[PDB]
Amino acid sequence: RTIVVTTILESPYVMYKKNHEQLEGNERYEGYCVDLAYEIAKHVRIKYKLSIVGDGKYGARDPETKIWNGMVGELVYGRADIAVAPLTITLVREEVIDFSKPFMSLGISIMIKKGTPIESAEDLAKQTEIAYGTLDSGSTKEFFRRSKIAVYEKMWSYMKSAEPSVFTKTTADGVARVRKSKGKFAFLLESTMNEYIEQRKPCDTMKVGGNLDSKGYGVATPKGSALGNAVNLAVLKLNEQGLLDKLKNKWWYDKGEC
Amino acid sequence: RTIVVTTILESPYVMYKKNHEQLEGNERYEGYCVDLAYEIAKHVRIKYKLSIVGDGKYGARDPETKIWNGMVGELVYGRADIAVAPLTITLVREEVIDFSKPFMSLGISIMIKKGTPIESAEDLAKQTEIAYGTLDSGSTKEFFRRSKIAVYEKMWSYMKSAEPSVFTKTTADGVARVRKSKGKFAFLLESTMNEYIEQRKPCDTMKVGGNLDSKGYGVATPKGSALGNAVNLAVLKLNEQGLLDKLKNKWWYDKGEC
Ligand SMILES: N[C@@H](CCC(=O)O)C(=O)O
Ligand SMILES: N[C@@H](CCC(=O)O)C(=O)O
Ligand SMILES: [Zn+2]
Ligand SMILES: [Zn+2]
Ligand SMILES: [Zn+2]
The missing domain is CATH 3.40.190.10 (Periplasmic binding protein-like II)
Known part of the structure; x- marks a missing residue:
């Protein structure tokens, strides 16, 4: 009941x-x-x-x-x-x-610490100074694992092979990693979470680029x-x-x- | 088969x-x-x-x-x-x-002829110089008919009783009406169609405001x-x-x- x-x-x-x-x-x-x-x-x-x-x-x-x-x-x-x-x-x-x-x-979005020189998935994929990751056991990670779109395939290959893991066990961990990484970590997460976080103190993160997908x-x-x-x-x-x-x-x- | x-x-x-x-x-x-x-x-x-x-x-x-x-x-x-x-x-x-x-x-969106002094549903609702309507037999019309939100209720009340009809039988008719009406007609239609028309010559329409809903x-x-x-x-x-x-x-x- x-x-x-x-x-x-x-x-x-x-x-x-x-x-x-x-x-x-x-x-x-x-x-x-x-x-x-x-x-x-x-x-x-x-x-x-x-x-x-x-x-x-x-x-x-x-x-x-x-x-x-x-x-x-x-x-x-x-x-x-x-x-x-x-x-x-x-x-x-x-x-x-x-x-x-x-x-x-x-949609999957990119969260960066404010001032991070990233504006798009392409920007992330074409470089290595700024590490990026996603939530483990989540649809975003699967999105990349499964994507046949070249740039996402490249991001996946980077993430998949990232050490230590760029996969976080909670969104909070990913956000924390962005906030603490002085711009050297971007987090791939859903726009909803990205946007919410963007509106919470310390207001040091922001969503960049459009959404990588729509769901x-x-x-x-x-x-x-x-x-x-x-x-x-x-x-x-x-x-x-x-x-x-x-x-x-x-x-x-x-x-x-x- | x-x-x-x-x-x-x-x-x-x-x-x-x-x-x-x-x-x-x-x-x-x-x-x-x-x-x-x-x-x-x-x-x-x-x-x-x-x-x-x-x-x-x-x-x-x-x-x-x-x-x-x-x-x-x-x-x-x-x-x-x-x-x-x-x-x-x-x-x-x-x-x-x-x-x-x-x-x-x-989402439901407002299509105006470029230059029309409307930026929102509220802007449409609070005035009468600019007529506005929607497609007949579609979800947009139902959205207004069914809405309990004051602004949309007011818009529905307007549209329901506008004469001549502000309801069009095809999206194309609504778009044509926007285009021909010198900014005195705005068309409530889904953002998708709006965005498409925005991309077509004569390039005289645009989507304005946010979407009224999300679907x-x-x-x-x-x-x-x-x-x-x-x-x-x-x-x-x-x-x-x-x-x-x-x-x-x-x-x-x-x-x-x-
Ligand atoms: N909403 C996602 C979790 C967050 C993410 O993967 O970005 C899911 O259902 O797996
Ligand atoms: N997509 C809508 C038609 C367009 C509209 O109502 O604005 C429907 O399924 O009814
Ligand atoms: Zn196919
Ligand atoms: Zn407690
Ligand atoms: Zn023909």
């Missing part, structure tokens, strides 16, 4: 509220996806428990074991009834889980889940009611700091 | 080739959706025949008869197996047909259609393989004229 909603602590989607340690259950969290979950749950008429994905990962199929990790894994292996998170709709994932229509559009986050459910339909309709309704836009404004721009 | 692909004559998605009268079948047409259908069909491994929707409409449900027209109707009533078209994914359509994940992201086109199939799955996976694959980006460039920007 209480459905398990897997999600990931990723600002501003799901964040601990400042006074959270005096709260329990869903009350502890706030953010775009918390609001989204609330709104979805309201329309799908379910009780739900927000559960932060144990491994902290979005989800990436180990090529050896074929095991899916992250929230995708939570869904695939029956541990969560629905993932409400900035979980990118991708082909390999759609093969194993269902996604609502996107509740957010985004969406969807609310994910186990393949064939009967929840999937209601959730999809809920997402479409929320988008059309302008709630998603309002939420985006509320969580990205309204509190903007830069 | 041959699946019927409904689509609509809407530049640059589907256009007659110059020598179309010499040609038969799919060869008659060219454009983004013609290329996309070709790629989708190749990847789904189906033979298909493009069939231009008779009523030249995207699809809306007549409140009286409850009859779906346009491409949505072609799918709903079993005359087409798939719609490959700039068909907006909407809640009401999703209730009657299936959509792939979006192959294009877009996507999906390749549509009849609810529960088996084809739906492969098509969705095809779209995801083509997206990730950069096809859609390439097609967008090919049909919008590469031949750009402005």
Whole structure:
């Protein structure tokens, strides 16, 4: 009856509220996806428990074991009834889980420390002084691994062969690496996160160049889940009611700091 | 065996080739959706025949008869197996047909003749000298009809009762009206079409302001259609393989004229 909603602590989607340690259950969290979950749950008429994905990962199929990790894994292996998170709709994932229509559009973007002489993926690919990386177990890394576009193939080859790893285990780590690397690290991450971070103190990062691709986050459910339909309709309704836009404004721009 | 692909004559998605009268079948047409259908069909491994929707409409449900027209109707009533078209994914359509994940992201946008003193929906809403309208039988019109947001409600109220009609039967008609109206007509249409027209001579129109909303086109199939799955996976694959980006460039920007 209480459905398990897997999600990931990723600002501003799901964040601990400042006074959270005096709260329990869903009350502890706030953010775009918390609001989204609330709104979805309201329309799908379910009780739900927000559960932060144990491994902290979005989800990436180990090529050896074929095991899916992250929230995708939570869904695939029956541990969560629905993932409400900035979980990118991708082909390999759609093969194993269902996604609502996107509740957010985004693209892979480059985050640089302000003043970094990078304006594009091409700029990154044609040089080596500025290291770059992406989130592990995420759609962005897969994008590059799988890309047949020459420049991205080159970036992938660099990243894949980067030592130490230029793959981070959290977005926060990637952002931290950008911020601490005096311009010598650029982070490839989704424009949504990039933009949010760009608006948070210390305001020392920025998104550069256009998006490398265009995709969406969807609310994910186990393949064939009967929840999937209601959730999809809920997402479409929320988008059309302008709630998603309002939420985006509320969580990205309204509190903007830069 | 041959699946019927409904689509609509809407530049640059589907256009007659110059020598179309010499040609038969799919060869008659060219454009983004013609290329996309070709790629989708190749990847789904189906033979298909493009069939231009008779009523030249995207699809809306007549409140009286409850009859779906346009491409949505072609799918709903079993005359087409798939719609490959700039068909907006909407809640009401999703209730009657299936959509792939979006192959294009877009929003309602304002097309003005260059020089028109309008920079936003608010600018349009708060005034009457500049008439504005949208396509009939499309998601844009429904967006305004359905909107509970004051500005758009005001715009809807304006449009609903504007005389003569500010609603056009084709995008082309709306564009032509913008172009002919000396800046006294603005056209609310999807950013995609807006951006395309912006790139075409006489180069006298432009998209202004941000998009009013954010949504996507999906390749549509009849609810529960088996084809739906492969098509969705095809779209995801083509997206990730950069096809859609390439097609967008090919049909919008590469031949750009402005
Ligand atoms: N949204 C991504 C995670 C962030 C990224 O990979 O950039 C995913 O679902 O995997
Ligand atoms: N893409 C829209 C048509 C264009 C518009 O309504 O502005 C639809 O599917 O209805
Ligand atoms: Zn705590
Ligand atoms: Zn002709
Ligand atoms: Zn192909």
